[PDB]
From Swiss-Prot:
Sorted UniProt keywords: Glycosyltransferase, Host-virus interaction, Inhibition of host innate immune response by virus, Restriction-modification system evasion by virus, Transferase, Viral immunoevasion
Reactions mediated catalytically: Transfers a beta-D-glucosyl residue from UDP-alpha-D-glucose to a hydroxymethylcytosine residue in DNA
Subunit comment: Monomer.
Purpose: Catalyzes the transfer of glucose from uridine diphosphoglucose to 5-hydroxymethyl cytosine of T4 DNA to yield glucosyl 5-hydroxymethyl cytosine (glc-HMC). This DNA process seems to occur immediately after DNA synthesis since the DNA alpha-glucosyltransferase interacts with the clamp protein gp45. The glc-HMC modification protects the phage genome against its own nucleases and the host restriction endonuclease system. The glc-HMC modification also protects against the host CRISPR-Cas9 defense system.
EC assignment: 2.4.1.27
Protein name: DNA beta-glucosyltransferase
Listed pathway(s): Genetic information processing; DNA modification
GO biological process: DNA modification; symbiont-mediated evasion of host restriction-modification system; symbiont-mediated suppression of host innate immune response
UniProt entry tagged with the keyword Glycosyltransferase: yes
Organism for this UniProt entry: Enterobacteria phage T4 (Bacteriophage T4)
GO molecular function per UniProt: DNA beta-glucosyltransferase activity
First-tier enzyme category under EC: transferase
Claim: Glycosyltransferase is one of the keywords in the record: yes
Length: 351
């Protein structure tokens, strides 16, 4: 049984970009599952083979990682174009890994014909006619179906917790008790709107020692509806593999609500935080049914509650350890069902 996996809109060669890294890690976890799989991209390399040099029909299953398919500066994007040509030459069912609400499968032909360079491609060459099965990271399938309502060749839907691939990895490890230098830590990037609102709510004017790492600066929060006086310390981007170690420096780490995930998608960040040495506090709206941790003490609804919970954690090293052993126990128990997770995955791709 031969399996092929590709990314539909980004080049894949090594760990120089986030999407190339994700595709390679997915490839690794699939292999550690005992399956024979190849990554197919624009060129040969340590982890890949070239589109030009393979017969897409030698593979029994073709897995496709979701991505956006816009053409930057109005120019041709080989990654997208080449991937869709490959998918178009495939004559069996295609498996679409849907890990982000914003990246639903989409035909690129309708947008190509209107470009001045349309003569470089034909409809038979780009239009993907094979049936498509969406493998949803999100547990709500109605939402998955609503996002792919514009493409009818997408006929199947199934939920699979894809984002657990990092904790099931062979060389994965949990954090160890770390010297604390922060009360609260949060990672992310700025964006106006409700996001600015949520961030100002939980991380500004708290009186606590909060650090904010990622693509965000004090000068970007300007909405007059979300006024603030004291801001957290912004430290900018970190190395790709430093999330857990970064969180381990704080008593608590926060996960904030976001309509793109709420009560649907569990994210990679949730596992990165849960595995750290910091107590994971979650915005109630992100998981109202408490699917993540069935203990209300890990959930906060607003600023006052966040301050309260964190001061409780600082004044009682006993409470901190107990809550910490509870989240780790959940993670360990989840890592103990690896075989079930693997089987569930094989089943999902019809093996």
């Amino acid at each position: 049984m031969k399996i092929a996996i590709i990314n539909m809109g980004n080049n894949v060669i090594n760990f120089k970009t986030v999407p190339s890294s994700e595709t390679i890690y997915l490839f690794k976890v699939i292999s550690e599952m005992g399956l024979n799989v190849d990554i197919i991209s624009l060129k040969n390399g340590v982890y890949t083979k070239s589109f030009d040099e393979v017969d897409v029909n030698d593979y029994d299953r073709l897995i496709v990682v979701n991505s956006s398919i816009n053409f930057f500066g109005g120019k041709p994007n080989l990654a997208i174009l080449s991937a869709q040509k490959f998918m178009a030459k495939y004559k069996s069912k295609i498996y679409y890994l849907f890990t982000d609400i914003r990246l639903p499968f989409s035909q690129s032909w309708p947008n190509v014909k209107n470009r001045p360079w349309a003569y470089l491609y034909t409809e038979e060459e780009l239009l993907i006619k094979s049936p498509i099965k969406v493998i949803s990271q999100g547990i709500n399938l109605d939402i998955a179906k609503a996002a792919h309502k514009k493409v009818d060749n997408v006929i199947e839907f199934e939920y699979f917790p894809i984002e657990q691939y990092k904790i099931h990895m062979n060389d994965f490890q949990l954090s160890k008790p770390t010297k604390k230098t922060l009360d609260v830590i949060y990672g992310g990037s700025f964006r106006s709107g409700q996001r600015e609102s949520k961030m100002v709510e939980f991380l500004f004017d708290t009186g606590l020692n909060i650090e904010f790492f990622g693509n965000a600066r004090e000068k970007q929060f300007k909405n007059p509806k979300y006024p603030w006086t004291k801001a957290p310390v912004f430290t900018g981007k970190i190395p790709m593999n430093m999330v857990s170690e970064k969180n381990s420096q704080a008593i608590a780490a926060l996960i904030i609500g976001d309509k793109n995930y709420n009560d649907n998608f569990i994210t990679l960040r949730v596992w990165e935080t849960m595995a750290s040495d910091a107590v994971m506090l979650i915005d109630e709206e992100f998981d109202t049914k408490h699917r993540i941790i069935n203990d209300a003490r890990f959930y906060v609804n607003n600023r006052a509650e966040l301050i309260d919970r964190v001061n409780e954690l600082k004044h009682s090293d006993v409470l901190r350890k107990e809550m910490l052993s509870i989240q780790h126990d959940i993670l360990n128990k989840t890592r103990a069902k690896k075989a079930e997770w693997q089987d569930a995955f094989k089943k999902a791709i019809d093996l």
